[PDB]
Design a protein around this ligand. Sequence first.
Ligand code: CLA
Ligand code: CLA
Ligand code: CLA
Ligand code: CLA
Ligand code: PHO
Ligand code: BCR
Ligand code: BCR
Ligand code: BCR
Ligand code: CL
Ligand code: CL
Ligand code: FE2
Lengths: 81, 34, 334, 36, 341, 137, 442
Amino acid sequence: TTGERPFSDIITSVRYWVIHSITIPALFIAGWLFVSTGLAYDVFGTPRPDSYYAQEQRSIPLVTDRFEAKQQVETFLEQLK
Amino acid sequence: SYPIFTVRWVAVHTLAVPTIFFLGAIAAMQFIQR
Amino acid sequence: ANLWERFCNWVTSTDNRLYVGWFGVIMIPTLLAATICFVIAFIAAPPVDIDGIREPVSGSLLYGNNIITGAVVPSSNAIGLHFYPIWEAASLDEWLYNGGPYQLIIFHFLLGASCYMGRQWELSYRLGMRPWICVAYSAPLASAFAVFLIYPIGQGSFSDGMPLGISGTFNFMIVFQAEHNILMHPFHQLGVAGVFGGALFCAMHGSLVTSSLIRETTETESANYGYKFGQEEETYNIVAAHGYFGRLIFQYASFNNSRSLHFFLAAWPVVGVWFTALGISTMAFNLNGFNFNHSVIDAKGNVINTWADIINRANLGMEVMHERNAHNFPLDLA
Amino acid sequence: METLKITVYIVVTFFVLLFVFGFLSGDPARNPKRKD
Amino acid sequence: RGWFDILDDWLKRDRFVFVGWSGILLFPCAYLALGGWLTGTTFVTSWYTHGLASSYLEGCNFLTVAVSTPANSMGHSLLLLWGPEAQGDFTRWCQLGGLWTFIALHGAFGLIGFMLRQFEIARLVGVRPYNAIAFSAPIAVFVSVFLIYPLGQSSWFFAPSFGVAAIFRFLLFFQGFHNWTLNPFHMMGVAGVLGGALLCAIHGATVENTLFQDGEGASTFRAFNPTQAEETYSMVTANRFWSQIFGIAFSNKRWLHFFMLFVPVTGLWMSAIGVVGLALNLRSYDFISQEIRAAEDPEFETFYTKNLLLNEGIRAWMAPQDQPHENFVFPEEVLPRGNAL
Amino acid sequence: AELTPEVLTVPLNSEGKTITLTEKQYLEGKRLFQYACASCHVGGITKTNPSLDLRTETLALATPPRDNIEGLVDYMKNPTTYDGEQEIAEVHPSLRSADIFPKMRNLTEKDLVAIAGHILVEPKILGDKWGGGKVYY
Amino acid sequence: GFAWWAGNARLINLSGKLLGAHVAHAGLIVFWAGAMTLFELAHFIPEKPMYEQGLILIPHIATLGWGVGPGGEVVDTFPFFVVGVVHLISSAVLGFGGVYHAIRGPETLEEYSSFFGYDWKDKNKMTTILGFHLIVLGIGALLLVAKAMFFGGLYDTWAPGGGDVRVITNPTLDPRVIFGYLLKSPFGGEGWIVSVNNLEDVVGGHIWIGLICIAGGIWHILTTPFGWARRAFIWSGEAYLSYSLGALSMMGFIATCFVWFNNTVYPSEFYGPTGPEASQAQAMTFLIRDQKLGANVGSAQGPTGLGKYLMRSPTGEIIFGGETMRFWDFRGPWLEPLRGPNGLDLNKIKNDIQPWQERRAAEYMTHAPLGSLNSVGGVATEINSVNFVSPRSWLATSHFVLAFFFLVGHLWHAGRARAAAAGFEKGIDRESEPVLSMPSLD
Ligand code: CLA
Ligand code: CLA
Ligand code: CLA
Ligand code: CLA
Ligand SMILES: C=Cc1c(C)c2cc3nc(c4c5[nH]c(cc6nc(cc1[nH]2)C(C)=C6CC)c(C)c5C(=O)[C@@H]4C(=O)OC)[C@@H](CCC(=O)OC/C=C(\C)CCC[C@H](C)CCC[C@H](C)CCCC(C)C)[C@@H]3C
Ligand SMILES: CC1=C(/C=C/C(C)=C/C=C/C(C)=C/C=C/C=C(C)/C=C/C=C(C)/C=C/C2=C(C)CCCC2(C)C)C(C)(C)CCC1
Ligand SMILES: CC1=C(/C=C/C(C)=C/C=C/C(C)=C/C=C/C=C(C)/C=C/C=C(C)/C=C/C2=C(C)CCCC2(C)C)C(C)(C)CCC1
Ligand SMILES: CC1=C(/C=C/C(C)=C/C=C/C(C)=C/C=C/C=C(C)/C=C/C=C(C)/C=C/C2=C(C)CCCC2(C)C)C(C)(C)CCC1
Ligand SMILES: [Cl-]
Ligand SMILES: [Cl-]
Ligand SMILES: [Fe+2]
């Protein structure tokens, strides 16, 4: 009724699945790799199971300065190296 | 005689492309172990 | 012309200003008993030893309550699930102390409310209507059965059914959370979805019809005077409402069938609230909300808290403080 | 108390029987369309 | 036929998803708010702001995942990516809670955009703008809770975090610290939401059970026609039924549907006002008469005093893990507890 | 932080000899402990006698000392009261009483060591939480 | 008339296809009983209590006396296997008859045989089918009597010695006992039929119900409904479904309270302790612990001024203190030895508690029917560790839900039945609106 092509007609179409039986697994795999490679950890700054605390540490590394905050978590992060 | 690429095409892919990617990332995550 | 037949015709008459009916024959006396006892108790009942520990809680206005703090207090934990009519007490003074009025009120109300639902079926039949309004009402009714009867049955005491008061309601819902983690229970989450969604769709439907009213009036008069009770033509343009809302989202997510739309209005909050009534009814048998306390730990095995653990710190504060003189052993098992 | 108890048993019984016999009295037939 | 009009032409074309001028603000902001929430809930921690795990990547599930608020130490920093806190570092920005402000602000501007969309489409279609007006209610709630409330407090830290269980924690916080259930503006909201759901269910059921017989099938949905002039159900029989069951009934279809707009809209607006009071810790926490009597009369007890004990339990048992920046140390012996528990 | 040999290293006996558990043994003992013990000892408390816990300092003051593999393995065979004065196999699960406590029946000797190892390791990981109760949840 | 989503209403007057639907669905029921049992058995570990293991069908078999010995020790797993296999195999035959009658067999029966054919409005034919099933039901209840008396007996949690399988030689026949249950109050300390606490009454009632169902089954084959019945009911297929829905709903609520309260036909050895049981058990556990330390539990005044361990019920019986005062109606075989005529007996408490009682109390206390939906055991504030939700909670909650919707289904189908019978289920005739011909109310 607006002149685009009907959805029911695209997803039963052979040409549609010829493309999307590639594009959909490629994206699912790409997402996999983002995690399985470890990249997601480094991009987002998220701790790995072994790096929430230092070995004998039980203190949360809680940000407590506004303008030094960047420097704080970098300090807490090298207290694990 | 329909267009292939439309505003509609774009809004759909705007959502569905990262949806799959994200499902892949989350699928991998079920296999992470401490 | 026979005497019983003339009685039966008056009971079922479609001409009484308020329909009576056979369900009405039971509803009226029980709702009056419950209402009258409620009113007197709320104003004037002396304090009630709800928890059976000789620690009476004052619920009525004349004993130092206001509208917000007052309640008919649930009956004593010493009674448990035992039936405690007036004639089982040595006196009204004993019956008042142990919380007899609560039982009287709840049993009469639940009976009368159940007949209220039946009455809704009945008049629908006398008037040639379809019958299922009463099914809509079973959702609230179910909810009242859960907090006044099913939860007490599962927990072994009416002392733990919901007080009949504003602040007592809040007491009941805080203690529930501490003991059942209702917030983390899916059936409660579907209740919120049924209630939030119901309010949303109420507003939506009322604003769509209101937006598409057909001009029938001048600027100087309520548009409401554009509808005359019992007119045969519709009073709004549904195709205009459809055309606006379809474009607001997209065409196929809008209703153009008014029957489907009005059935959707009915089903969403009825079903959501069935589930939330089912939530109270199954948590009554201590099948509680999801427990993710300490579910996340690190490579060494430190606990890594989540929001579930914070929620648990709050639940704990409720736990350890509620009914602070009534527990002698370390687990509050009912 | 015993007098209260009798009275209630009597009142309740009375209403419950009105209810039972009321519906036994041809309730299907009291509608606006088809009577039997 | 200047360019402005050419663009208007294009923005307002009838297509599967209408765009409009409001589209320019709506679509980027709605998509970014929603992408930020999915991104943070999938990958981003709350370890450095809250000492919490909060993403699927860390082990959380859909209930416990959240985009959490910034550390209390940020105050009300806009926390711009390019701002003095994160200094352009995406990674640090995430770690300092910058996605919370991203989401909250792009969300606010999407809400505006969406309300402008309701205004734009209503004008193009020739209908009254009551759906835009009703949508003011959600807006009030969002701004009061997510913006005004934490702006009255020490920091964004105490706004709601965007997550299922984080919101449950926010509910419980408000009980123990604000005694929000006692607040008559929340009670008016309760009555609007519950009253809305009631109206919704009672109006749908009524229509469905006063239908006219307009077709032969057992499925009555088939017997409506969007363009029929005739009412599809009987207001008259609906009105007699309710007059006889409940005593009163609607007789004016127009009033009824306006009332359906009015009830839930008004209730949400009242609760927004109450949250503005709690922005300032202006609570209905206590009744002074009750407290005076209770302090003097150790036998006087109400549901009002019982609930304050529960609030006191909540505050002391949750504060240290919920407010880590405060370094609350409560030794065992100062925790309020009843017997045995 | 991670499960390092220094944390997996616990006293074998009161002499002062030590044993280093494997990660395997640790997780083996945790599982076995949930199977046979946690119903009463979840988190290192004792739900049916909260005055006695599984903290290392409590076990150390038991008679005979129980802060070591030998003491704990022995306790699982022939449990006594805290002062050592009476044998309580009739009311505490033990190999001695596996006939009335059927879950102890398929426990081998190396299962006992994994369980004793878990009990001694967990306080090093969790600290006050272990045996501390709800205050530390 | 009906749409796809109400498409099974298209079978109302196709007796043969509707037969297939019922028989095929009965096949699903038998299938699940078979498969589920084999699953539980495959996952069963004998050294662990059944209730630590998520089992709901093995406990019903054990309760019939198969596979268990004294104390509920599982001694032989083969009866479990057999019950599963035979059910599973039987479901193929019912599946077979179902698909045949739904797909290939005659759509309508009344032409093939005048016997199997029926019209919903044939009050004689309908009462005859009812009578056949009544006899079947009656036979079935006698099967249980036969097991109890002539084929091994039943598990008796009350048997002296910790419980045991026991043949029922003297079933209760006195109708003052049997029907007495049906007139006890459903309130606390009474409990209607849920309070049945001995196998003689269980077996005796099944004798009576067997005879009653056979008698009434013969009655209904021989009679047609009297006129007062003819005039009070609606006679249609939907009407009859609505009557059964009501009855199943009532039965479901009863079953809920049965598994929640009754520890005789749901022995606690198998199903775990009831809520009241576990709560009594905690008070016992600390009474025992404290007394060994030298506490005089009789004389120990707790905080409130009530006894810390022992108090009086409102009718004077000596009972357990604390919140468990609400559960003093609890009766269990591990507790009854301590009861005298005035309730709990202080001299037996001081002197005669046995290790096995201490053990049972510790066990039941730590297996209270509390747990999360994801099967973390204990109070909602407990930490992860113990994987446990009591069979009693799973059985209570599931049947409350099902009972509730069947009640909703009764209202749905009853009101529709009435409206269809009177001819206005599809809506109001615009040319004859009943309200437009009534006087106005004001
Ligand atoms: C003995 C039980 C019984 C029987 C034989 C019937 C029979 C019938 N019903 Mg009734 N009904 C019942 C119980 C029963 N009902 C109950 C308990 C309720 C309350 C919920 C209802 C409510 C009800 C309504 C509201 C309506 C009927 C209707 C009908 C008719 C058409 C039904 C159809 O085609 O469904 C088709 C089946 C479906 C559309 C599928 C439904 C699936 C359910 C909702 C999902 C359940 C999900 C499950 C629990 C968990 C999901 C797990 C996941 C992995 C899949 C038919 C005569 C219709 C009618 O009046 O016709 C005359 C109708 O409108 N029934
Ligand atoms: C317990 C579930 C149940 C049962 C037993 C039935 C049974 C029936 N339905 Mg109902 N139905 C159900 C659920 C059920 N339905 C639900 C959940 C819905 C909602 C979607 C519907 C919607 C529905 C509609 C809309 C209609 C029916 C109709 C019918 C009847 C004719 C179907 C037919 O000819 O199939 C034709 C189908 C096939 C030939 C496909 C194969 C189906 C077979 C049975 C699969 C079995 C496989 C199995 C593994 C084989 C084991 C075999 C071995 C034992 C030998 C039949 C008696 C129809 C009817 O009334 O006709 C008058 C009809 O119009 N049903
Ligand atoms: C209660 C369910 C039920 C009902 C009412 C019917 C009714 C009917 N069937 Mg169906 N049938 C059923 C179940 C049912 N069948 C099952 C389960 C199967 C699969 C085995 C079949 C397979 C089947 C076939 C293949 C055919 C029929 C046919 C017929 C018709 C003729 C019956 C006749 O003359 O039999 C003659 C009667 C006998 C030979 C007596 C049999 C004695 C039975 C087997 C013993 C009963 C004992 C007890 C009730 C079973 C419980 C045991 C178990 C619990 C261990 C009739 C309308 C025929 C038909 O309609 O043709 C058009 C036809 O061809 N049926
Ligand atoms: C599946 C079971 C079943 C069903 C559906 C029916 C159905 C029917 N029976 Mg039959 N009946 C059955 C089993 C069954 N019967 C058995 C086993 C017997 C032998 C005792 C009888 C003996 C029998 C006789 C003697 C008569 C019927 C009659 C009838 C018809 C009228 C029923 C009626 O009005 O009841 C409605 C019930 C009442 C009006 C009174 C009930 C009052 C009680 C006290 C209600 C208590 C409910 C309470 C909440 C629950 C607790 C129980 C309480 C005792 C403690 C109807 C077709 C009549 C008929 O027309 O037959 C030709 C008739 O006269 N039935
Ligand atoms: C929690 C309850 C709740 C939700 C989820 C909700 C949702 C919605 N209501 C809308 C409309 C409405 N709501 C209305 C009344 C109400 N709405 C209510 C309650 C709610 N309304 C209540 C109670 C009422 C009664 C007054 C009306 C009258 C309307 C409409 O007209 C409109 C509609 O069409 O409904 C069909 C839609 C607006 C779509 C939009 O702006 O897209 C654009 C999306 C944007 C701009 C992004 C916003 C981003 C948000 C604000 C911040 C980020 C959120 C995260 C992504 C997710 C976090 C999730 C965690 C918190 C768990 C949307 C579906
Ligand atoms: C932030 C940011 C950004 C952006 C981003 C984005 C935009 C994103 C997006 C994203 C997205 C876009 C995502 C998505 C995803 C999705 C998901 C992940 C989904 C899921 C789902 C699910 C899982 C579902 C399922 C289900 C269920 C559960 C139930 C029902 C059914 C269903 C099937 C639905 C930027 C760059 C600017 C920069 C700055 C920052
Ligand atoms: C009609 C219809 C329907 C329905 C269906 C049905 C319901 C069916 C049924 C069916 C069935 C109901 C089936 C059954 C089957 C079964 C079987 C076939 C079995 C077998 C088994 C076996 C083979 C065994 C073996 C074994 C042994 C012997 C031993 C142990 C082990 C084992 C297991 C291996 C539907 C809905 C679809 C649709 C529409 C139509
Ligand atoms: C087995 C057993 C036993 C016994 C049992 C019995 C013996 C039972 C009985 C039961 C019965 C014997 C029941 C009865 C029933 C009845 C009913 C449930 C009725 C109903 C009714 C109705 C429903 C009605 C209706 C109506 C009306 C009212 C009015 C008009 C209309 C109509 C008709 C609708 C015992 C416990 C010892 C133990 C264990 C085992
Ligand atoms: Cl409290
Ligand atoms: Cl207690
Ligand atoms: Fe409407």
